[PDB]
Amino acid sequence: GTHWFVTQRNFYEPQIITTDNTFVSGNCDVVIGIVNNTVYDPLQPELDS
Amino acid sequence: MQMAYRFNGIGVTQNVLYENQKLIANQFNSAIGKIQDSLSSTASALGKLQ
Numbered sequence: 679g680t681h682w683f684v685t686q687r688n689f690y691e692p693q694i695i696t697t698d699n700t701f702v703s704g705n706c707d708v709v710i711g712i713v714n715n716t717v718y719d720p721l722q723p724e725l726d727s
Numbered sequence: 728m729q730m731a732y733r734f735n736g737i738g739v740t741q742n743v744l745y746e747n748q749k750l751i752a753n754q755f756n757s758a759i760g761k762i763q764d765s766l767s768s769t770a771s772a773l774g775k776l777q
């Protein structure tokens with residue numbers, strides 16, 4: 679309703695959308711139906727150490 | 728998304744579909760449209776049922 683997660687296909691188990699479970703391809707204008715949401719980087723708290 | 732999961736089934740990543748969706752749709756429409764011409768011209772395909 680407000681926040682975006684990623685699940686597996688056959689069982690609802692939501693997880694935070696990071697750079698580990700997603701892969702980067704292309705840019706924004708080609709994909710039809712794309713949305714806007716932040717993708718979390720796990721390296722940032724280690725950079726804040 | 729169903730077509731993307733079919734491509735992920737046959738070992739091709741989803742960005743191939745999501746960057747060529749219009750081309751894939753046009754190819755599918757042409758492939759369906761050839762079938763009507765083939766069935767209207769050649770009536771010997773139904774030899775098993777005949």
Ligand SMILES: *[C@@H]1O[C@H](CO)[C@@H](O[C@@H]2O[C@H](CO)[C@@H](O)[C@H](O)[C@H]2NC(C)=O)[C@H](O)[C@H]1NC(C)=O
Nearest residue numbers: 679680681682683684691692693694695716718
């Ligand atoms: C949809 O998911 C979001 C993200 O988890 C929920 O927002 C959180 O709700 C919990 C409930 O206690 C809070 O502690 C968090 O602070 C909320 N925000 C975040 C960023 O985690 C939300 O409640 C869910 N439901 C709806 C209807 O939006």
Ligand SMILES: *[C@@H]1O[C@H](CO)[C@@H](O[C@@H]2O[C@H](CO)[C@@H](O)[C@H](O)[C@H]2NC(C)=O)[C@H](O)[C@H]1NC(C)=O
Nearest residue numbers: 682705706707708709710711712713714715716
């Ligand atoms: C997702 O964000 C992009 C930009 O980050 C939005 O695209 C437009 O981008 C230009 C240049 O950056 C802005 O001047 C426009 O204001 C943006 N459009 C809008 C409606 O804000 C894109 O529209 C965003 N998509 C969604 C669904 O919010």
